[PDB]
Amino acid sequence: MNDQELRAYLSQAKTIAVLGAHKDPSRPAHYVPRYLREQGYRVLPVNPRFQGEELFGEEAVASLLDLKEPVDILDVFRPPSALMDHLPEVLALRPGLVWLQSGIRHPEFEKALKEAGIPVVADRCLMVEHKRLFRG
Helix, strand or coil, X not given: XXXXXXXXXXXXXXXXXXXXXXXXXXXXXXXXXXXXHHCCCEEEEECHHHCCCEECCEECECCHHHCCCCCCEEEECCCHHHHCCCHHHHHHHCCCCEEECCCCCCHHHHHHHHHCCCCEEECCCHHHHHHHHHCC
């Protein structure tokens, strides 16, 4: 996505589901979502590892299909070796955009999303990118 379009996309978005949301403050899967909530987004934590625990002001759910509202951005922190097993729930939720966090790439997974008509941004830190597009 070019910057102009990616900016229009991020500024209009409201709900960001964080796949692999973490409770430990030092983890990117915790502090990136933290930053996002500050920027006015509704962050929905998803991680079976913390199911039921309140993260980012919301109760974490085990599966994407447990979310009770449309997802504008799916911020993915799960490693490449775990992505294919999530594909079914990802395609089912059909988020407006899939964002693979830093150090996460997966050809087949990415190709499957493209084929389903779902935009993908890969190997980028959403916080960093948000800062660069809306502050300089």
